[model samples]
Target: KVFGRCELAAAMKRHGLDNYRGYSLGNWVCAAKFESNFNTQATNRNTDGSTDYGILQINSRWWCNDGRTPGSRNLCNIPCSALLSSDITASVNCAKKIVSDGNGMNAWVAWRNRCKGTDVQAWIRGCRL
Candidate 1:
């Protein structure tokens, strides 16, 4: 399922990403735009053989276990497939876990380059929370 901008923003907010770890809803929404373009089934394979899954692009190297990444820890304790669902519960949970790390939202380079320190209000502008 591919979500529109506002739809994705509302869903992320519903899952409590709004300022969950010093980042705002707009940050999360903007990151999702660059990460997967809001596609629930988006999967990207890293050059190192790790795969990123779902809208938030949870990684197989540390977050989810795809059974293919060489040293996957599955820190989120979830199958990578769970992230591909349209519900987004597992994906959201893993995203929170990612930001809980010392790097915070910097875990996603896309977020750093695009959303961080920018006027991201446009990401959630028309969406009524």
Candidate 2:
């Protein structure tokens, strides 16, 4: 799949992101690749069906407390699995929030300063939004 770059860009803008070229996309892609390979519908579950979760690996029990009710509110109330659903914009936005309230841009900077080789995070953090 394309990983919904269009929606990703729109979501970034909704979160007050501007010029999302240099490192914003880079950070997102990097995180997605590292987390779920851009699988917006990926999920992981534990025994007892208590820890079933979705993309970004958000534990339903931790983030969404359905209490085995099949759909409860946990941490953010938004189902972790929803992060990987077909809602590309929502998924990307959720992912961004998960990573430092979409402030991965800052972490990107920190990561870059620490790691050499054209750090995208650094570029994103440095770029004016």
Candidate 3:
């Protein structure tokens, strides 16, 4: 049920990711491992009582200006929670965009390199979606 709700498989499918044999699933799985530890129902609360919601730790409170309505605005401007609620693919794609936007994976790659030696599993985690 948790897996279904998070729609991990569907998300991959939506992206045409039919094969997990090589590094595809491993890359995404690694990212998820680091981000939410595979916990789809994860959430975090700031000291100010605002919320960082969902498995990807998307902060809708900050990103959603339309007051929690899904698809209220373009994902590029909308909050992460709204994006996650719309689709995991969108959420992941959004994160990937942010990571690759100006730096072109430089930040993510650097993160991977830094954490790889200590925890390879954790290294690739959240480096993707």
The best candidate in terms of TM-score:
1
Model 1 residue 125 lDDT score: 88
Error of 1 at 64 (Å): 0.7
Give the per-residue lDDT of model 2 (tens digit) for 33-109.
Answer: 44555565666566747553343455564455535636544646565545556555544454444455445444333
Model 3 earns a TM-score of 0.47
| Residues 1-129 of candidate 3: C-alpha lDDT, one tens digit per residue | 044323564465466543333234444544455556656566665565455544455554434343544344433575544543535655565555454445532334433654333543433344334
Q: Which clashing pairs does model 2 show?
A: 40-84, 63-74, 63-75, 64-74, 65-73, 65-74, 66-72, 108-121, 108-122
TM-score of 1: 0.96
Count of clashes, each model? 0, 9, 4
Model 2, position 93, has a per-residue lDDT of: 51
Tell how far residue 36 is off in model 2, in angstroms: 1.2
Winning candidate number (lDDT): 1
Spell out the clash pairs found in candidate 3: 30-125, 31-125, 31-126, 63-79
- lDDT tens per residue, model 1, 44-129: 88899999899988889888888888866989999999999989999998888888889999999899988888999888887878
Instruction: Mark the 10 consecutive residues where model 1 has the least summed lDDT.
Output: 63-72
TM-score of 2: 0.48
Ranking by lDDT: 1, 2, 3
Give the clash total for candidate 2. Answer: 9
